Design a protein around this nucleic acid. Structure first.
Ligand SMILES: [Mg+2]
Ligand SMILES: [Mg+2]
Lengths: 217, 218
DNA sequence: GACG
DNA sequence: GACG
């Protein structure tokens, strides 16, 4: 299809609200894993996988343009006030230099992985990038939704939210459901359930991020 | 003295070995924090929570020489396994990245590292000297958490990272195998008495471009 | 020492 | 659904 994805980038965004509200990103986290590190499961239940030794990790809190919805502030512990008080910058030109440089240290093709990404994280990110005079640093990178991926894996009435899956696989509640990094780590663990099968699935379904259309605007 | 450092960037490096060995960085973690983000109830005193708003960067870096057996034992990293997963080298992009990471910080910026005055800071300087790019740390500052933690404790035996932690908190550090683990350990330590901590560190911050390279300038 |  |  687009060849074997050499790097998986688990991605999660915290933001000001749900899609209907035209949300802005308050926190982003990327965790780049090499396929090799990934294809590097137990019995029942299997232990929670340890993450690979070799990973690159990025986590940035971000001052949004508009205030957080009350619901989003309670879930994330983030507000427009504090991100600005504490001097967080906008989703600006730099941030894309930063992402660019971070993406630059991953062997291509890179494929972004997000949970409900096709509905939420991907179109959100696209929107936020579109706002920039800078060129997007993701044009060359691919993406895929982990919900689709795990529906297929688990096939070998269920909820497919992040926590429903995680608890189901490992019979443990996820560690941190309130930060971008927490959600990425939970995401990573469900994707390590069947590393072999999943990377195969990711390779078949990888899709260009350039196409992903904006949530809004 | 230099003014107020806006960002405390806790820093830790893993590497091929110790200073005598001419060591190369293999992993790097920065956790950037704002002076704002800085009580406790119970015994032994709880391991505090990292603050909510933080920027975190953690990168694996391929070194041009093999990891000494002791560095591999500590970190579980090896040159060949970094290279499998096509980790890059400490190059110009990296500096751009760090540049950009630091440029998202409120200035001025002060690195804090455990033994940095003797290991991380001079080593970082060496890594940055090797390449085409200007250093991103040319305008950055530095302080050692050992010296800092000395004072603060002497106003209330070993000062290895773990010894301080286990002693304040009565738990083993969560992870001593990775750069982020050490940054987080270092972070919790610096939250024992953050008020003073930061009192202590705005009095002491110093240039990083005064930092002499551990070695080399090949 | 204390850092890998 | 499921994302904040
Ligand atoms: Mg999410
Ligand atoms: Mg250290």
């Amino acid at each position: 299809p687009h060849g074997h994805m050499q790097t998986l980038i688990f991605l999660d965004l915290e933001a000001t609200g749900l899609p209907s509200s035209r949300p802005e990103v308050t926190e982003l986290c990327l965790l780049a894993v090499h396929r090799r590190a990934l294809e590097n499961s137990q019995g029942h239940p299997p232990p929670v996988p340890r993450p690979p030794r070799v990973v690159d990790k990025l986590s940035l809190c971000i001052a949004p343009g508009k205030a957080c919805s009350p619901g989003a502030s309670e879930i994330t512990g983030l507000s427009k006030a504090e991100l600005e008080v504490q001097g967080r910058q906008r989703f600006d030109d730099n941030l894309a230099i930063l992402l660019r440089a971070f993406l630059q240290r991953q062997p291509q093709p890179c494929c972004l992985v997000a949970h409900n990404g096709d509905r939420y994280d991907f179109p959100l990110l696209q929107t936020e990038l579109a706002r920039l005079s800078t060129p997007s640093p993701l044009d060359g990178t691919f993406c895929v939704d982990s919900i689709a991926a795990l529906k297929a894996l688990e096939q070998a009435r269920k909820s497919y939210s992040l926590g429903s899956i995680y608890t189901r696989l490992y019979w443990q509640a996820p560690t941190d459901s309130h930060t971008a990094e927490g959600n990425v780590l939970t995401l990573l663990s469900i994707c390590q359930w069947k590393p072999q099968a999943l990377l195969q699935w990711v390779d078949e379904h990888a899709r260009p991020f350039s196409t992903v259309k904006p949530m809004y605007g």
